[model samples]
Target: KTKQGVAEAAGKTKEGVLYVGSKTKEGVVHGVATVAEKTKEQVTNVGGAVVTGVTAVAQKTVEGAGSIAAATGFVKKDQ
Candidate 1:
């Protein structure tokens, strides 16, 4: 439900260097931004990639669920 919670779960379930890199960058940028008192600006700078990374994983999760539904006959597979 929470943003960080979702991102944490996605980071765990999605195994990829790209995800790791984005997550790491986000973490580092956030830390620095907080300390530097530029949280808003710094977060904006990296927000695009972070959003894209999370959205990508969310799509993958949906696709996987759809695959399972199809396999279980809850939904029909495409021809």
Candidate 2:
């Protein structure tokens, strides 16, 4: 809340006064810890999904190249 909109919610106009809420040290630390943990988990999940997708695409590309090479007689059976 700003100085002008101080008591707007409480339906008043305190021209220059502002109220800041307070939190305990423990509360602040716990809040930071919770946010950091959640952010790390989110990043790890997205990274895993991206790597899995890239690996799948690369595997398919290799398979396609191998098939083409075999069909074009570039690779021979070990008979």
Candidate 3:
């Protein structure tokens, strides 16, 4: 976070414009922030919908294993 604002270095979850995946690229996606249960494998985190999100579909699957209503993402790049 910077003084002007909290600036988190971009990563696999950094939210940004959908890089318009060019048939061979996994465009950037914003990781989201959500809340969920823990014991039931229902931990939630930001990973979708919001343009400022910082997570992807694959990540949510790990946290939402038991939940049948969890959203998920697909992989297109090694990033």
Candidate 4:
């Protein structure tokens, strides 16, 4: 964001957009970041919304498996 600010002060626009990405022959957005560079998978893993999230989908997945087993009586309830 700061880079954009300085460029605007220099009478420039998105021409100086400082970031990393994969541009096609005509420039396409494969990825980008103003703070730092990282991959899509890395972002997901770090944000903890997919793998190790606070409300992790992984946890839900395990619970789902247990629920299925319990509902199907596959877990042999204790007497």
State each model's CA lDDT, in order. Answer: 0.31, 0.31, 0.43, 0.32
Q: Which sections of candidate 3 miss by over 4 Å?
A: 1-26, 37-79
Q: Could you tally the backbone clashes for each prediction?
A: 0, 0, 16, 1
Error of 2 at 6 (Å): 23
Look at candidate 1 and tell me the lDDT of residue 14: 50
On lDDT, the candidate that comes out on top is 3
Q: Residue-wise lDDT of candidate 1 within 1-79, one digit each (tens)?
A: 5454233423455555544432323312122221334444334443223232111111123224434211211333579
After the best TM-score superposition of candidate 3, give how far the Cα of residue 34 lies from its true spot, in angstroms: 1.5
1-79: candidate 4 lDDT, tens digit per residue = 3442132222335766564444223222334434534735444343223332222111123224434211221333479
**Candidate 3's residue-wise lDDT over 1-79, tens digit each?**
5352233443354576543332322333456767655634344556533233344543223335566543545433466
Give the top-scoring candidate (TM-score).
3
Every model's TM-score: 0.11, 0.14, 0.16, 0.11
- Order by lDDT, highest first: 3, 4, 1, 2
Q: List the residue pairs that clash in candidate 1.
A: none
Q: How close to the true structure is residue 46 of candidate 3, measured as C-alpha lDDT? A: 62
Residue 75 accuracy (lDDT) in model 1: 38
- Model 1: residues >4 Å from true position, as ranges? 5-22, 26-79
What CA RMSD would you report for each candidate? 20.3, 21.2, 20.8, 19.0
